[PDB]
């Protein structure tokens with residue numbers, strides 16, 4: 001079974017690329033990472049930093065989660081990320097996305113032991 005930690009890595013980690021490679025990055029990634037299996041996931045973010053760096057965020061700046069929980073953390077340093085947003089013309093199963101590269105602080109929710117990232121809350 002896929003753990004919460006593994007799911008976070010599948011849905012949000014992409015250390016291979018340094019930034020939003022091409023304009024079709026999201027179209028390929030959202031599909032390959034199985035985010036368009038049962039439907040077109042509305043929005044999703046991929047982080048282009050090492051796994052260690054992202055996991056380290058769980059010990060960085062503690063901030064409130066969007067859902068009101070207190071287990072969210074903001075990276076002290078900005079990180080290379082790619083935001084994927086479904087286009088208005090997108091129609092399942094042919095999910096279409098707009099790829100946007102950026103450098104911002106990420107906010108992730110952490111849980112468990114080891115205390116690791118399990119949800120991507122936001123970027124600021």
Ligand SMILES: [Ru+3]
Nearest residue numbers: 077078105124
């Ligand atoms: Ru800043």
